[PDB]
């Protein structure tokens, strides 16, 4: 991804978008019971934490493109892929409005919670002044349809988040770009078809694993995945993709049935964003944040990891090739030992920045031991073998409960980490409430035990 250029919204046509300056990260009533060192990342070029220049620091994100055109490997990856996607018999059928906007089987509506972007961000018009979920009115949507059209500016907001000390020092904030409502609501009839497909059949076959439930999903995996595994991390995956991977995106649509409709993925290479007093032009890049884009960044994820198999191994057998996404994560493997540390090395050349998989200094084997996906690792029921336990380690969950975005939903969010902790073990997780109920706010919660917890899981299968 690259910034082709940037100036004052006003000289493009535009207004000044209003983004708060002020985190609604606090100190919860756990601040000072559990360990953790991240904080509220900045939110403003005025942070008395910074040490480097904001602005620069959030937009040197995009690294630039490494490629322009789909070179042989990338189209001998498309056509693997996409006889791939070709056994699901997806429905190429675009999706009703309705559907598009309040959902269906596959699909959950669109979330009212999250911005609706341009123009209506700067009508103080909400989404809630426009979706009913009890009516499932599609007549306000498909005026503003008629109205403002497709393909509108995306609203650059930084993402009010935890980071660790330096990135906060060096203002290493997330940007994200928000679709305005017309787009997501477009893209959504153009593609709900194939975005259910994929969330209903998470595996090796889609190559993803958007929409699953890791408490049920980590027992299907080990299944599906080959005798080696390997793995990596991309540094700033989404900004890194090179128009040439939209390109290959394009043609897997197209062979799949969806050639109908691949200018969306124009608008999401090549696409302008409004940020504050600014308007830029970026060529290449995903745009980040959001849901709306994980199955097409899975999607290209198996279309980056094929590419770098075919140019690094000739004669690899793709139809071995056994990998599951979740935007650029992955966990992946094969017959046969890769070398992750090489297929780095090819990476680079088409754009990517790959590293050791979870912080490792150095590219070391990757096993059933020591993997993770979505920060979690996998470890068999002590009881039942074949029940796998996706086991994300406290530190994170610990970190987390130190802070607060809402007094009114410390219930919910003291849950959800509770369903993420008692995989930990029952002495970790008895601790973990202990710490909780150590404090007012604690002992006034409603959370499970240990025992519900396991019968729970055992229940759900
Ligand atoms: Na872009």
Known sequence: GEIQWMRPSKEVGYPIINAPSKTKLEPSAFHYVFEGVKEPAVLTKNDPRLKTDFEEAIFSKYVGNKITEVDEYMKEAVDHYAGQLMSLDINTEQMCLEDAMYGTDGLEALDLSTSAGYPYVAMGKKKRDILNKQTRDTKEMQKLLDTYGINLPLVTYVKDELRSKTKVEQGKSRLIEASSLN????????????????????????????????????????????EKLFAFDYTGYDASLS?????????????????????????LNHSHHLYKNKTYCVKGGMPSGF????????????????????????????????????????????????????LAQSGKDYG???????????????????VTFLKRFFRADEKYPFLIHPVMPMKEIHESIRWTKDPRNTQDHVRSLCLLAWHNGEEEYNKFLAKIR???????LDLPEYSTLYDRWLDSF
Do not use: Q
């Open 438 to 444: 150590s404090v007012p706010i604690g002992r006034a």
């Open 183 to 226: 787009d997501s609501v477009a893209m959504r009839m153009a593609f709900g078809n194939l975005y259910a497909a994929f969330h209903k059949n998470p595996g090796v076959i889609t190559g993803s694993a958007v929409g699953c439930d890791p408490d049920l999903f980590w027992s299907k995996i080990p299944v599906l995945m080959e």
């Open 243 to 267: 128009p040439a991977w939209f390109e290959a995106l394009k043609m897997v649509l197209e062979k799949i049935g969806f050639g109908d409709r691949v200018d969306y993925i124009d608008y």
């Open 352 to 370: 990517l920045t790959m590293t050791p998989a979870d912080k490792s200094a150095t590219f070391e084997t990757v096993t059933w031991e020591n």
């Open 291 to 342: 849901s709306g884009t994980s199955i097409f960044n899975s999607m290209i994820n198996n279309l980056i990891i094929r590419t770098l198999l075919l140019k690094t191994y000739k004669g690899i057998d793709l139809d071995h090739l056994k990998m599951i996404a979740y935007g650029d994560d992955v966990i992946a493997s094969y017959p046969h030992e890769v070398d992750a540390s090489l």
